[PDB]
Amino acid sequence: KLKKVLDKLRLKRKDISEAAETVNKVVERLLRRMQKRESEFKGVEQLNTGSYYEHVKISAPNEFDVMFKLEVPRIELQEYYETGAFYLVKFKGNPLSHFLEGEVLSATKMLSKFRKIIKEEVKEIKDIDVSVEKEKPGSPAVTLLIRNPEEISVDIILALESKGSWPISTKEGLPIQGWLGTKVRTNLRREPFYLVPKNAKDGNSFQGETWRLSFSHTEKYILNNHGIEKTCCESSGAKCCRKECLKLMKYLLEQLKKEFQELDAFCSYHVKTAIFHMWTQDPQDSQWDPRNLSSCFDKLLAFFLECLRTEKLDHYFIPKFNLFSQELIDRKSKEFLSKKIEYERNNGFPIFDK
DNA sequence: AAATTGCCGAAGACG
DNA sequence: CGTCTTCGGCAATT
Ligand SMILES: Nc1nc2c(ncn2[C@@H]2O[C@H](COP(=O)(O)O)[C@@H](O)[C@H]2OP(=O)(O)OC[C@H]2O[C@@H](n3cnc4c(N)ncnc43)[C@H](O)[C@@H]2O)c(=O)[nH]1
Ligand SMILES: [Zn+2]
């Protein structure tokens, strides 16, 4: 049954080819515009991120994430309260001085200019049906809607790149020592970290100056390098069901969200985060054998339910940041999701039949 | 020093 | 299952 759902979720090559060709054209154009000329974002470089580029996109290739990363030397971080994930940014005749709010580099100001430039360039595209989606408060993304004629959304994510050591809130995150190992962890943490203009929500409003930590790069590496054995899912190695298990979990949540508005606060990142913990908990490739797909999915569900019940889902990189805190998601919303998942679980997943 | 190209892994296609 | 294919990521090289 699960194998047949996976067949259904699997992307078609023809769909991939048609989508990618258009998406790549638009992105390439936006990138060229940023880099030329007297622009504040002149040095941005492209990094493709998220589900599609992690090969865990399901159903249709209609969502693409891409970061435009900007190297900003000598920045100093001040943690926004005790959130671990959100920060104010300061510097130790720059183009970025336009975005300064005091000595603080404002996320809103920088994103708004970034967004303004994108809209200008999108207006000049004549051969492709593309529009800029209406702004979402808090969101770090400038979202494009493309009609290929099929609907495709492209999230362009502005990001600051810092080459320094990672903020201490991440010191006990990335607990992959018994799984991917110490050399991998050390090497990953020697890579840069990123800040995206996602504002912290403080009560009824957003703190417009705040930035948010990003490890979209690391997550991408982990998805592509996910086994304890170096040959996991390689041509001279054994196939595992780690990614398949993630697709099924993503699908379950997506179907549930499609018919229950009370689940708007839940997202695929919660699912991704839960399975990262699961991969830490069950490190052996043998406990992710394709023959044991059914029990792997069940283990994930039980773990997820327990996170729901205890209102605790630690960010994989920032362990003191609880994705399932009462502050972020209401108790009733979690209890609601708990009931739905339990139902689908005990009933052989009727919602998988659309 | 921006744009081209080579290589090959991941995974879809179909036997 | 194997073999072929395309897309993505990389960085040498001009
Ligand atoms: N990547 C990511 N996404 C996060 C997130 N916290 C919540 N979410 C949400 O999950 C979904 C992820 O999409 P995916 O393509 O990976 O399957 C989205 O619904 C995302 O919602 P969002 O409102 O927060 O973000 C919108 C837009 O911004 C990107 N984004 C959010 N946050 C980041 C970070 N930290 N780095 C890079 N990009 C980020 C989202 O991908 C989406 O494109 C989380 O921490 N990370
Ligand atoms: Zn594997």
Q: What is the 3-state secondary structure (H, E, C) of A70-131?
A: EECCCEEEEECCCCCCEEEEEECCCHHHHHEECCEECHHHHHHHHHHHHHHHHHCCCCCEEE
Answer for the pair A68, A158: CB distance below 8 angstroms, yes or no: yes
- Exp. method: X-ray
Distance CA A270, CA A314 (A): 10
- Which stretches within chain A are classed as H helix? 2-9, 13-35, 107-123, 182-188, 216-224, 242-259, 268-281, 293-310, 331-346
Closest CA to A218 of A304, A283, A315, A110: A315
Minimal-distance CA residue to ligand 1 atom 44: A269
In single-letter form, the type of residue at position A302 comes to: A
Residue with CA nearest C1' of nucleotide B2: A32
Domains, chain A, with CATH or none = 1-11+166-192+215-354 (1.10.1410.40), 12-165+193-214 (3.30.460.90)
By CB atoms closer than 10 A (0-12, 13-18, 19+), residue A347 is exposed
The tokens describing A293, both together, are 């797909």
> At what angle are helices A2-9 and A242-259 packed, to 10 degrees?
80
Answer for the pair A247, A56: CB distance below 8 angstroms, yes or no: yes
What's the Cα-to-Cα distance from A79 to each of A211, A221, A323, rounded to whole Å? 10, 26, 17
Distance CA A67, CA A248 (A): 26
Minimal-distance CA residue to ligand 1 atom 27: A141
Distance CA A61, CA A64 (A): 8
Answer for the pair A143, A153: CB distance below 8 angstroms, yes or no: yes
Answer for the pair A160, A42: CB distance below 8 angstroms, yes or no: no
Torsion-angle region of A344 (φ positive above 0: left; ψ -120 to 50: alpha; else: beta):
alpha
The CA R_g of chain A, rounded to the nearest whole Å, is 21
For the four alpha carbons of A84, A86, A90 and A95, in that order, the dihedral sign comes to positive
Q: Is the CB of A111 under 6 A from ligand 1?
A: no
- b/e burial code for range A22-56 (CB count within 10 A of at least 16 → b): bbeebbebbbebbeeeeebbeebeebbbbbbbbeb
DSSP, collapsed to helix, strand or coil, labels residue A160 as strand
Distance CA A117, CA A111 (A): 10
What's the Cα-to-Cα distance from A131 to each of A84, A111, A150, A275, A318, rounded to whole Å? 35, 18, 14, 34, 35
First to last CA, chain A: 13
Q: How far is the CA of A277 from the centre of ligand 2 (A)?
A: 16
Answer for the pair A284, A179: CB distance below 8 angstroms, yes or no: no
> At what angle are helices A293-310 and A2-9 packed, to 10 degrees?
80
Q: How far is the CA of A141 from the centre of ligand 1 (A)?
A: 9
Answer for the pair A303, A278: CB distance below 8 angstroms, yes or no: yes
The tokens describing A243, both together, are 């990614």
User: Where do we find the tokens 């258009």?
Assistant: A22
Closest ligand 1 atom to Cα of A138:
23
**Structure's resolution in angstroms:** 2.3
Closest CA to A94 of A185, A50, A160, A184: A160
